[PDB]
Amino acid sequence: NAKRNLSSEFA
Amino acid sequence: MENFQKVEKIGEYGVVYKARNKLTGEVVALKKIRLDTEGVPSTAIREISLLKELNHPNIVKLLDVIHTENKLYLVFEFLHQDLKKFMDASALTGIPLPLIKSYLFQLLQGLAFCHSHRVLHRDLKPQNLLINTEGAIKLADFGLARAFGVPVRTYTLWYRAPEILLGCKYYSTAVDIWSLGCIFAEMVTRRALFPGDSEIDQLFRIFRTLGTPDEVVWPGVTSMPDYKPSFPKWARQDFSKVVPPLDEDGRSLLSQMLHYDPNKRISAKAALAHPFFQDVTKPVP
Amino acid sequence: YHEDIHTYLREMEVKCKPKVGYMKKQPDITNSMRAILVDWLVEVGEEYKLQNETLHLAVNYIDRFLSSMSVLRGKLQLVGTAAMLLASKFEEIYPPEVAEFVYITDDTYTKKQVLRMEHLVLKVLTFDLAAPTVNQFLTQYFLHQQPANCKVESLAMFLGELSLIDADPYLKYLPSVIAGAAFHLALYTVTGQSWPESLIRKTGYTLESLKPCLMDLHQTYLKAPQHAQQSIREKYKNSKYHGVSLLNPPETLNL
DSSP: OOOOOHHHHHO | OTTEEEEEEEEOOOOEEEEEETTTOOEEEEEEEEOOOOOSOHHHHHHHHHHTTOOOTTBOOEEEEEEOSSEEEEEEEOOSEEHHHHHHHTTSSOOOHHHHHHHHHHHHHHHHHHHHTTEEOOOOSGGGEEEOTTSOEEEOOGGGOEEOSSOEEOOOOTTOOHHHHTTOSEEOTHHHHHHHHHHHHHHHSSSOSOOOSSTTHHHHHHHHHHOOOOTTTSTTSSSOTTOOSOOOOOOOOOHHHHOSSSOHHHHHHHHHHTOSSTTTSOOHHHHTTSGGGTTOOOOOO | OHHHHHHHHHHHHHHTOOOTTGGGTOSSOOHHHHHHHHHHHHHHHHHTTOOHHHHHHHHHHHHHHHHHSOOOSTHHHHHHHHHHHHHHHHHSSSOOOHHHHHHHTTTOSOHHHHHHHHHHHHHHHTTOOOOOOHHHHHHHHHHTOSSOOHHHHHHHHHHHHHTTTOHHHHTTSOHHHHHHHHHHHHIIIIIOOOOOHHHHHHHOOOTTTSHHHHHHHHHHHHTTTTOSOOHHHHHTSSGGGTTGGGSOOOSSOOO
16 A cells, blocks of 8 residues: 555645 | 866766866866666765765765766765776786785775774775875775665675675675785785686685685584585685785784684774784885 | 764764754644655555665655755655655665656656655755664664564564654654664563663663653553554564564553
């Protein structure tokens, strides 16, 4: 599960 | 780079030039790396990050890094030549013994400075030892150097320690000392001590020169990944034949510096206190 | 040369120490965002089989870069990816390719953006990527540990890795202090032993000197299962680390 787009989770 | 005028090309890491600073007037080495898909190379990154932490007289001092978007420039102090060229030029007659002792003393001082820090050279060879006209030798070519704050796992051939040849896992500091020891021999006999052609030919040459490693001399040889039971039972050669011009103290220092056991192999700090160095001077080359 | 190496590490951790409380000056990112970034970095490091020292170096690079630079919301993951790439280049034998990192970022930042941010991070740090981490001090501490207990080292590594998640309150402690607190906490947890006298002489950190850091690490360890970020606990839920993450933290630290 390392493939993540952290921008969505940051907000 | 705009303030540097490339005078000549000295070598071909990327190409390295001899240039001049227009402001200070000093002559410098201007090694360049073409920063392309991978970006800054790991070798260059390690060289800049470790050479800038080492400020010793017997170490090539990187003093400026012009890191642009398309190219990476490393500005070292310009030394006249390397130890390989000096040995090749002085091949008709042997290098003077006081000069050999001074060069070994400076090399071991640089190695001790590196090992007091957490920098492992792993690329100790005459092509990487620069010489100035003041009779001072300096370590260089830290592109292959690794920081061993945590143990460094194993990844030229002539100056490779027998531990690395026998499938060593973690790099120790002794792998540097061994290389220096080989250079020591190459400075006394004007010949590579172990001019191996392959990874097994080099091993056989080392075994012929220093004897096959038994478990008594080096505990743990049998349980090694690259050690084979089908190894000839050679006998250790007398160091008088190996290094004729070397004296008793020099022969003892070389024997302690080429110890098969990486743990028992002498360190640079301990080698600096050898009785061989009781008459060290600083002759010019 | 071991004592000289430790002395050099102690001298260098001060120079490489990130600015304390840099998150206050950050106008867009917060401590929780950094914790999420460290979580994702742990997950990436396990995905690519990278070393723990690589992740520690990457976290140090992120901390220093954000101390010396301001980064918006979107570019925080790019900064973390570039720091991970630099740490892999410096420490790992074969660093993962830039395309691998671009892929692991879910194709958010292109190769050009990753390389440009790597260049920016290298310029900001002025190529000072040799920062001492918790792992470097912990290995030296293990060299002075008797007997050599694998669970002790695994739990000390687990605690040190946990300390990378929250900048508050772990950027106010030196990496040597954090490593010593982690070693003592692990030794008490699995073996019931206190801070050894050998390390007392070697480092100068008495048991009362690490008491703030020790209590902070105990509080983090107790609340580790309830923490939002759980990459490290899953990583240390493996036979490689003897499953130290599943151990029950001691309720009371006898200080």
